[PDB]
Design a protein around this ligand. Structure first.
Ligand SMILES: C=C(C)[C@H]1CN[C@H](C(=O)O)[C@H]1CC(=O)O
Ligand SMILES: C=C(C)[C@H]1CN[C@H](C(=O)O)[C@H]1CC(=O)O
Lengths: 258, 258
């Protein structure tokens, strides 16, 4: 049967083509994950249909209800057969779905509006004039929450009680906040998005310091899925033959606007 | 039963303590992987015994005999229950044993003796005065062999026919060759070892350019192993709680001699 792929609109992984209203099926989308999905299906011998996750979320479990939302939820409840998106491999998600080995490596980073007097997380922790936060859901927020690490602890304690909220709903919101806060807001996000945005007009943002940790994005399938093993080998095969780095340069730097 | 862990002597992952002749059991060893093994066993609730792989190899399959050697072979033939070492996650190995998600991220890098007029793989490819090669077995050699990539292809073609051989048997051999060749030999090795050696006396080596690819080291277990699932979750748990980065700084930079 045709494999149902769930994904999410996040640049430059999956984006609607400018003329999407005139197209149908998979041709309506473009991006790193759209190309990766084609390669995975090709190497695994299956036909597929790209779909955008119904609730527009990545995947977290609600306290109290214990229900999984986002792409993870669609896999958990059988609404989709595979998730191909910038879904960070985490302990809680690994417990309910299967992840392929990383197709992309990344780490938590700091985004500032050019000119902001901040060079590291250390600088952020030892001050409050410049507010800073993470996405309101996701692996970055969890990193600070579970962090023994010192400077990261002063940061989580600060972010948790900061008013107004320093957390943003999406990457677009965090970037807009950095750009419109005249240097008074720094956004903690994954290096992949940071590096991408740095090469997009208005070219007014910058990634500072080194990554705070090392993690990866993985292709997800429901536990005990037949396609799981084949997809994992496909990711390794594509990475070893340079397809993945070629794909990143295509969507990150070949398209640089700065 | 006590879990048999197979590992390999590779600095600073596993090293014999200076006074090892006076110790017994696991206390004879020290290093990043020795500490990681303790953490994995603790989080997985098992007793273990560290052993050094009999043939002193990582794991490759012989053509003609089709027999697996090294740590991979010990897992494949049931001589060990788990491998905890800087074993690169690769397609061919993933097909015969199970790998946990990466406990360390790395990429192929270039090591030169300080002063060598080389800054990138591109520089290496467009010349021959300065010889360069990889370890005679392993994932780095395979990267160049399977590389479509252009400059990397000119490099593999050159390395394959270069005389005398530009390939080295071990990290120690590659480093000794770089140090004793008066700038006429550059070694292609994993960034982890490169970064480590750069901070070790004589402090005469340097890592140049950016990594050529992105890969990781994983903990290995025989296929269908009971411990596999638990070990994978332990790696993710330890990484999220900062144990892994803390462990890398302990063995890489806290001990810097330069
Ligand atoms: C864009 C979002 C909400 C994602 C993408 N990867 C992370 C995840 O899969 O949780 C989230 C980012 C972050 O947490 O910084
Ligand atoms: C040190 C050795 C021989 C190893 C360690 N990781 C790689 C592996 O697991 O193949 C090899 C290095 C390399 O290929 O550059």
């Amino acid at each position: 049967k045709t494999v149902v792929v769930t994904t999410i609109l996040e640049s430059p992984y999956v984006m609607m083509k400018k003329n999407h209203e005139m197209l149908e099926g998979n041709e309506r989308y473009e991006g790193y994950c759209v190309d990766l999905a084609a390669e995975i299906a090709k190497h695994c011998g299956f036909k597929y249909k790209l779909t955008i996750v119904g609730d527009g979320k990545y995947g977290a479990r609600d306290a109290d209800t214990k229900i999984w939302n986002g792409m993870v939820g669609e896999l958990v409840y059988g609404k989709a057969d595979i998730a191909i998106a910038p879904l960070t491999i985490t302990l809680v998600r690994e417990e309910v779905i299967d992840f392929s080995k990383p197709f992309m490596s990344l780490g938590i980073s700091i985004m500032i509006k050019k000119g902001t007097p901040i060079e590291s997380a250390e600088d952020l922790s030892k001050q409050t004039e410049i507010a800073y936060g993470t996405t309101d859901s996701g692996s970055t927020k969890e990193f600070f929450r579970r962090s023994k690490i010192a400077v990261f602890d002063k940061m989580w304690t600060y972010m948790r009680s900061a008013e107004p909220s320093v957390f943003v709903r999406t990457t677009a919101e965090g970037v807009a906040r950095v750009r419109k806060s005249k240097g008074k807001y720094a956004y903690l996000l994954e290096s992949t998005m940071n590096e991408y945005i740095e090469q997009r007009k208005p070219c007014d943002t910058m990634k500072v310091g080194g990554n705070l940790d090392s993690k990866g994005y993985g292709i997800a399938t429901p536990k005990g899925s037949s396609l799981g093993n084949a997809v994992n080998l496909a990711v390794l095969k594509l990475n070893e033959q340079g397809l993945l780095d070629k794909l990143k340069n295509k969507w990150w730097y070949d398209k640089g606007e700065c």
